[PDB]
Design a protein that fits this description.
This is part of a larger assembly, with chains A (about 120 residues) and B (about 55 residues). By secondary structure, chain A is mainly α. Chain A is built from 5 helices and no strands. With about 55 residues, chain B is low in regular secondary structure. Helix content of chain B is about 10%, strand content about 0%. Chain B contains 1 helix and no strands. The relative contact order of chain B is 0.15. Classes of the chains: A mainly alpha (about 120), B little secondary structure (about 55). Chains A and B meet through loops of A and loops of B. Chain B: It is found in: Cell projection, Cilium, Flagellum membrane.
Chain lengths: ~120, ~55
């Protein structure tokens, strides 16, 4: 019960701030990808997608991967095994989103607009 | 009834190969494109979201 009481009073060791800041980003991203794969597939509507924000989505997903990496090592530098088995997934978790949000792009490539 | 305006294509595709459709660009490129049935050219939105109302 000591562990929570300390950090309840005051701020946090560095690893917790970054890592959790990628969990919200993982959800904020999980929402949008769901709606985009919703509209592309179920209601088969090609209007209510991204393609107005196709860059900020990808940019953030780079941050959401990088921030997990920096936060992970701090936990592993501290060595707390609870964090160690925790963050490593969050690196691979957000690694799943990036490789999925990237295949939704090469799928909706003939459905976005044109640039060349 | 005789005054008109004409555009020379400038491509010089022979009629016989135009019927054939495999005329070669001195390299191997196809002069003539055979459109798929019920083709409609794309719209502004995407190559796969047509809205023309004209059929080819």
């Amino acid at each position: 019960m000591r562990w929570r009481d300390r950090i309840a009073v005051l701020c946090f060791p560095p690893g917790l701030m970054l890592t959790v800041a990628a969990l919200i980003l993982f959800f904020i991203h999980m929402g949008v990808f769901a709606s985009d794969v919703h509209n592309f597939c179920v209601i088969h509507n090609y209007d209510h997608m991204s393609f107005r924000y196709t860059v900020v989505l990808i940019f953030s997903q780079v941050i959401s991967i990088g921030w997990a990496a920096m936060g992970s090592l701090y936990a592993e530098m501290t060595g707390d095994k609870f964090l160690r088995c925790f963050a490593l997934t969050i690196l691979i978790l957000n690694g799943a989103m990036f490789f999925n949000r990237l295949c939704l792009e090469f799928l909706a490539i003939n459905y976005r607009e044109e640039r060349h | 009834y005789l005054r008109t305006m004409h555009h020379t294509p400038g491509r010089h595709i022979p009629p016989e190969d135009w019927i054939s459709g495999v005329h070669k660009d001195s390299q191997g490129f196809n002069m003539i494109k055979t459109l798929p049935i019920n083709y409609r050219p794309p719209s502004h939105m995407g190559i796969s979201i047509p809205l023309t109302d004209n059929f080819y």
